[PDB]
Amino acid sequence: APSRNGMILKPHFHKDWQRRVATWFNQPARKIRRRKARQARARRIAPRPASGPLRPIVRCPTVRYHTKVRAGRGFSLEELRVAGIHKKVARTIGISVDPRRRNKSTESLQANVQRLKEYRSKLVLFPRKPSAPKKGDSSAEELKLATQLTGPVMPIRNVFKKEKARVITEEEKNFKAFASLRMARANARLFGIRAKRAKEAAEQDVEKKK
C-alpha cells in the first residue's frame, strides 16, 4: 500500500529472477584473460600491427551522430579500384574490405582512397623468401623496423576547420533566419497540395477551350 507521496513505481521482480542473476566476479579474471590472449596474438602476427587491418573512415548515420566520424568495417570496392589495389590482394596486406558498402558522395570516396594511398606509402611489405624479388621493400626498411604498431593503425581523429573572423557583409546582417526556416517548413508542408490545385487550375483552363 502506498503512503503519502512517491513514484508509483513498477519493479520487474515477479518472474523467478534469482534463478537468472548474473554475477560479475569473473570480470578481473576475464579482463586478464583477454589481455593475455591479446598479447599472444600480437606475438603471433610478428611485425604486423597488433590492431588488425586498416579500416576506412566513415560517417555515422542519423541527424544525431551525423557530424562525427568513426572507423568503418572495411574499404569499398570503388575505393580499392581507384587506389589500384586488387581486392583479393588487399586482404593479404592488412586492408579491411567490405563489399556491401555503397558509395554515395565523392567526398567520402576520395578521402578513403587517400587513406589507402597513405597506407601503401608507410607499409613495409616483407618478401616471401629472404631472397628478395619485386614489391618487397629494402633490407634497410626492415632491419630498422620489424616493429609492431601499437594501437589502431593510422587512427581517425574527428577534426574541425577553424573559421577566421569575417566582417559581416550587409546581406548576412540582412538575412531573416527564423523567418526563412518558418517559410522553408511551410513550403515542404504545402508543396504537394499547391501542385494539386495548380493541376486543377490547368485542367480548368484546358476545359474552358473544349
Judged by beta carbon distances under 5 to 8 A according to partner kind, the member of other proteins, RNA, none in contact with residue 131 is none
Site for other proteins (CB under 8 A): which residue of 175, 205, 206, 209?
A: 175
Closer residue to other proteins in complex, CB, 8/140: 8
Task: Assess contact for 48 and 148: CB atoms under 8 A.
Answer: yes
Q: Interface with RNA includes 134 (CB under 7 A)?
A: no
Cell of 30: 576475464
Site for other proteins (CB under 8 A): which residue of 122, 172, 205, 209?
A: 172
Q: Interface with RNA includes 65 (CB under 7 A)?
A: yes
Which region among 23-31, 34-42, 113-121, 197-205 touches other proteins (by CB under 8 A)? 23-31
Q: What angle (nearest 5°) sits at the alpha carbon of residue 205, between those of residues 203 and 206?
A: 65
Which residue shows C-alpha cell 557530424?
67
CB count within 10 Å of CB 101 equals: 19
Nearest approach, Cβ of 134 to RNA (angstroms)?
12
Rounded Cα gap, residues 114 and 156, in angstroms? 13
C-alpha distances (whole Å) from 109 to each of 96, 187, 199 are 15, 33, 42
Q: Interface with other proteins includes 40 (CB under 8 A)?
A: no
Task: Assess contact for 57 and 72: CB atoms under 8 A.
Answer: yes
Question: In the complex, which residues of this chain contact RNA (CB under 7 A)?
Answer: 8, 10-16, 34, 37-38, 41, 52-53, 55-56, 58-68, 70, 72-74, 77, 86-88, 91, 96-105, 107-108, 130
